Amino acid sequence: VRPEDLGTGLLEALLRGDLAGAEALFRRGLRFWGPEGVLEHLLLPVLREVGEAWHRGEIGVAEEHLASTFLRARLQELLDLAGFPPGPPVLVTTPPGERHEIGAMLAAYHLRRKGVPALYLGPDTPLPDLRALARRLGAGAVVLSAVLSEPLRALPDGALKDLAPRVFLGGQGAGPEEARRLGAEYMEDLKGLAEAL
Amino acid sequence: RPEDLGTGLLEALLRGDLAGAEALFRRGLRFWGPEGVLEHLLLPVLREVGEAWHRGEIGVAEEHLASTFLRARLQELLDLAGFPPGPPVLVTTPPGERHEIGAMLAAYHLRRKGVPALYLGPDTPLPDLRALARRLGAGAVVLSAVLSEPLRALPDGALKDLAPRVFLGGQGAGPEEARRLGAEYMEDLKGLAEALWLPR
Amino acid sequence: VRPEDLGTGLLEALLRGDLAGAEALFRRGLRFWGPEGVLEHLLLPVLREVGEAWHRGEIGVAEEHLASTFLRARLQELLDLAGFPPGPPVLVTTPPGERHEIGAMLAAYHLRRKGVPALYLGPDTPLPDLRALARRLGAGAVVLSAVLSEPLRALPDGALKDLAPRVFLGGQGAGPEEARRLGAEYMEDLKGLAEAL
Amino acid sequence: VRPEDLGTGLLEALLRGDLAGAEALFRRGLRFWGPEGVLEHLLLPVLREVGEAWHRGEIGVAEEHLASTFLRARLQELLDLAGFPPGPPVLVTTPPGERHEIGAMLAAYHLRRKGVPALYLGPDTPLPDLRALARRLGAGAVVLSAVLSEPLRALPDGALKDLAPRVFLGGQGAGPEEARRLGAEYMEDLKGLAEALWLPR
Numbered sequence A, C: 001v002r003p004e005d006l007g008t009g010l011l012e013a014l015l016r017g018d019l020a021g022a023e024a025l026f027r028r029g030l031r032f033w034g035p036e037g038v039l040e041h042l043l044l045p046v047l048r049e050v051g052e053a054w055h056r057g058e059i060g061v062a063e064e065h066l067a068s069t070f071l072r073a074r075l076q077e078l079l080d081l082a083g084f085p086p087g088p089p090v091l092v093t094t095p096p097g098e099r100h101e102i103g104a105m106l107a108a109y110h111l112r113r114k115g116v117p118a119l120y121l122g123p124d125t126p127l128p129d130l131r132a133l134a135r136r137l138g139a140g141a142v143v144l145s146a147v148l149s150e151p152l153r154a155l156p157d158g159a160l161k162d163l164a165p166r167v168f169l170g171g172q173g174a175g176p177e178e179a180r181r182l183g184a185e186y187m188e189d190l191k192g193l194a195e196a197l
Numbered sequence B: 001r002p003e004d005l006g007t008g009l010l011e012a013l014l015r016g017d018l019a020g021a022e023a024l025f026r027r028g029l030r031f032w033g034p035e036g037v038l039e040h041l042l043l044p045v046l047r048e049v050g051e052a053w054h055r056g057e058i059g060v061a062e063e064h065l066a067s068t069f070l071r072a073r074l075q076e077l078l079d080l081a082g083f084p085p086g087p088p089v090l091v092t093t094p095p096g097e098r099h100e101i102g103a104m105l106a107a108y109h110l111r112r113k114g115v116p117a118l119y120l121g122p123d124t125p126l127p128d129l130r131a132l133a134r135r136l137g138a139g140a141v142v143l144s145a146v147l148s149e150p151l152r153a154l155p156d157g158a159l160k161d162l163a164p165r166v167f168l169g170g171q172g173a174g175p176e177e178a179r180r181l182g183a184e185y186m187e188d189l190k191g192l193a194e195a196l197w198l199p200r
Numbered sequence D: 001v002r003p004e005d006l007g008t009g010l011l012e013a014l015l016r017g018d019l020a021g022a023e024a025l026f027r028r029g030l031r032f033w034g035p036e037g038v039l040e041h042l043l044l045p046v047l048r049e050v051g052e053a054w055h056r057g058e059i060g061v062a063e064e065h066l067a068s069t070f071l072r073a074r075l076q077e078l079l080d081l082a083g084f085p086p087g088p089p090v091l092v093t094t095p096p097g098e099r100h101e102i103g104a105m106l107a108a109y110h111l112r113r114k115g116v117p118a119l120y121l122g123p124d125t126p127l128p129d130l131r132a133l134a135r136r137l138g139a140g141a142v143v144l145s146a147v148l149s150e151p152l153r154a155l156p157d158g159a160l161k162d163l164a165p166r167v168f169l170g171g172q173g174a175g176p177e178e179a180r181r182l183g184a185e186y187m188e189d190l191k192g193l194a195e196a197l198w199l200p201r
């Protein structure tokens, strides 16, 4: 199968529970596109199509869970391969109540690929606890990924100010006005995070 | 240093030294092998993280960091156990149960015995779980519960007929609640494949 | 299949020309041991056994070549998946006359995994040319890997002293007295190269 | 745009140590033209420009090394992506004394793309050792790539004849007379190698 058909192939493999086939297809994508390219051209398009199929009522949450778990495992492999430099970390998580992790992990990965010690905490970190860890580790920045807008709507004005010296908010759930309200710097593009630091 | 590995790993995680944590875990693999490292290093460290949190010695951000690391290690082992062909067993946690390690352990113990255990991730709504089991023709569904409250919230018979065999375990579960929910109850993961193969 | 048998399995696969099997076994070792661990537990033991078997006369050069080429290809794959930060590079190569690449690639990999922009040049770089590139790119360091002692012995006293602001020499062909003679800093372990920098 | 237009950009990224940029540009070329087109119209032209610039004294050995190592890494990725089929292998190497790899790796790639199990040994394999491995693995063919002519001149008449059931020789260092002297089948076209083995399909 051609590169342009790897996305359809992967989604069909996952929807029939063929994890071995899915792993093979993803690895082919990695080899063809390289790491950034496989995320852009395979991981993200499959995740989005899973979401659309769910919105259309063609699949349920269990199929989305299966696909997201698979894709998380693949991104975690890449994250581990990028390595973790010493020095003051950037803490990467999602707002309280946000359980979608891929965006955060993508942010951490893009940072790690540029030599930044992005410490992915997992999703859904209470803000007092996040601030306390940032302070204790001397973190240079906190990065939050918000896929949904509702977890941000739940936060009080200024809630993200002073989590760390720099606080960045992105994801589809976030916009510049909400970032301003919460006291974060907004960034639309993952590729601009490493530059900003 | 086997006797010191657990303390070393926990300290590395709590200072954000992921490189050190990874090195120590690999040393645990060298000492104890794949199953052994789970029993002697992963689970003791997970439990000490939880206890330290319960005592107020660490916050949620530290616990998250450590749990994320340990989940990554267990996912590696789960993937190394392989995924055989044939009708899958779906493995997840009840609605409202966000803790994953027990479910991943169940999937691992199944896969190492040649059972195609598909780990979905945690916290799967039951109608959705039923629909996926149907779509994949799953022979069994396995749920891991660390907390009892998510189970208490579920209706009588909520787990019955998710597949022809349904198992519930984890410290949050007990035989009476399993019975109420329409699931079989088991405590030993080393017997779970055998229990599923052989008649109820 | 079992971790303790991956070395035996990989060597046997390579000696029978089973590259698909070898690739699968190496990937298993990567998953089990992690990026640095697979080099310590699988790649280096297999490389060394191949070399020793050749020195004992038990295998021919074609068999040795196949295995060494395969292992280099796997290390190059890992190297490319590491972070590559912006900023002044560290140039990594081998002395003039040293054709063996693995130690240099290992050095570059260890440095990239610690957030250092190590440029692996390939092996066997003439010193004037190496200095010129280091100067033009503003490299902070040059790192040389020597498996054989004879290429070092052929160099005049002080030959390595001004290749860059810091010059490190390691590999089993090097020792502290030779490093001193040649004007390089010696290090035995790659684990403290990044710290020293 | 043709792939050759990216050549200046790629080489300049490499020469300033911008590995990420060089890799990004090469991958764009792969996406736009695919592997065969990028190899013929970007990798080989850049390799040749690097070599000629070195011969002209315009770049030093360290810059040439960096560019050659990068291009080999990209070709090795493609070689591995083409996969390794089962079946009696074709051993692919270069003559004793030939250290240049790219032509051999291209031959292995073109064979693997057509479903032929081409085992790339690396360069510079002694002939009796190569013969021994070919016999032991039951190889259907040996393929040699020569960039330099002197390694071939060094070989005795008929040296290549019986390395395997078929023996193919190409690269700019080889020509038909020398192949005939050495007992190899002379071949120039990479894409025609698999067909020359007379296998099914």
Ligand code: B12
Pocket (backbone or CB within 6 Å): A044, A047, A048, A049, A050, A051, A052, A054, A055, A064, A068, A100, A101, A102, A103, A104, A106, A107, A143, A144, A145, A146, A147, A148, A149, A168, A169, A170, A171, A172, A173, A187, A188, A189, A190, A193
């Ligand atoms: C997949 C998807 C989901 C998935 C999420 C996948 C998962 N579980 O992991 C699921 C199934 C959860 C889902 C359901 C819902 N989601 Co939805 N679905 C989508 C979809 C199709 C793709 C978006 C996505 O998840 N992309 C993955 C992320 C990583 O991409 P991203 O957020 O765009 O982030 C990019 C950048 O921002 C950047 N980035 C990410 N984080 C950060 C951080 C920083 C600092 C920086 C610099 C950059 C950065 O990287 C990413 C890739 O480049 C979109 C529609 C679309 N966009 O085509 C909606 C969409 C986002 N969903 C929507 C919403 C709100 C929902 C629902 C509430 C709707 C519903 N009930 O039907 C539910 C919520 C239920 C719940 N889960 O809580 C709506 C939002 C608009 C609205 N209606 O208000 C959307 C936009 C669809 C639409 N057009 O209406 N959804």
Ligand code: B12
Pocket (backbone or CB within 6 Å): B043, B046, B047, B048, B049, B050, B051, B053, B054, B063, B067, B098, B099, B100, B101, B102, B103, B105, B106, B142, B143, B144, B145, B146, B147, B148, B149, B167, B168, B169, B170, B171, B172, B186, B187, B188, B189, B192
């Ligand atoms: C670690 C831990 C946590 C961690 C979990 C980290 C993680 N998992 O990523 C953290 C700190 C997050 C946590 C939080 C809380 N937890 Co807590 N904590 C624990 C602790 C110390 C250990 C839990 C554990 O061992 N997990 C590992 C799993 C795999 O162990 P397991 O379920 O026992 O499973 C074993 C077997 O059952 C078998 N198995 C597992 N699944 C299955 C499935 C099948 C089919 C089979 C056959 C076998 C099987 O395998 C396992 C190993 O042999 C215990 C106390 C203790 N010493 O046990 C509590 C405990 C579970 N926590 C408790 C509580 C209440 C909480 C909190 C609600 C407290 C709070 N107010 O916030 C929160 C949960 C909030 C939330 N939703 O996150 C209570 C639960 C009481 C109850 N449900 O009746 C406990 C018992 C402590 C106590 N005595 O009060 N906790």
Ligand code: B12
Pocket (backbone or CB within 6 Å): C044, C047, C048, C049, C050, C051, C052, C054, C055, C064, C068, C099, C100, C101, C102, C103, C104, C106, C107, C143, C144, C145, C146, C147, C148, C149, C150, C168, C169, C170, C171, C172, C173, C186, C187, C188, C189, C190, C193
């Ligand atoms: C593998 C091997 C080969 C292979 C090499 C395959 C390949 N493509 O790499 C083959 C068979 C080709 C080979 C050939 C020869 N080799 Co040989 N072979 C070895 C062997 C078994 C292992 C070498 C090795 O470990 N390489 C891997 C590198 C990475 O390990 P390393 O240099 O020890 O580096 C470690 C650390 O120093 C650190 N590190 C590496 N670089 C750097 C740099 C810095 C800055 C730092 C901080 C750290 C660091 O990382 C590594 C961690 O383990 C050894 C004996 C042995 N058991 O060690 C000999 C040995 C190196 N070979 C030797 C010889 C003599 C030869 C030949 C000259 C033999 C001959 N023809 O007569 C030829 C060379 C010509 C040739 N190309 O054929 C000698 C060299 C002795 C000396 N004083 O130089 C040895 C020691 C054997 C002996 N005689 O005892 N060899």
Ligand code: B12
Pocket (backbone or CB within 6 Å): D044, D047, D048, D049, D050, D051, D052, D054, D055, D064, D068, D099, D100, D101, D102, D103, D104, D106, D107, D143, D144, D145, D146, D147, D148, D149, D150, D168, D169, D170, D171, D172, D173, D187, D188, D189, D190, D193
């Ligand atoms: C690039 C190059 C280099 C690079 C190579 C980098 C690298 N890692 O590959 C560098 C700068 C390192 C180099 C070094 C030298 N080179 Co130079 N260089 C060239 C150059 C510019 C191009 C070579 C090339 O195209 N290689 C890529 C391969 C794939 O191309 P190809 O062999 O033509 O193969 C084609 C087909 O035959 C097919 N193919 C290849 N193999 C096979 C096999 C089979 C079976 C089939 C079917 C097809 C096939 O694929 C290709 C498609 O176009 C040429 C001049 C020119 N413009 O052609 C010289 C040239 C080859 N170099 C030459 C020389 C002399 C040298 C040096 C000896 C210079 C010196 N040091 O003094 C050194 C070699 C040092 C040593 N080995 O010890 C001479 C060789 C003359 C001769 N042998 O009679 C040439 C011809 C230049 C000249 N006119 O003087 N060189």
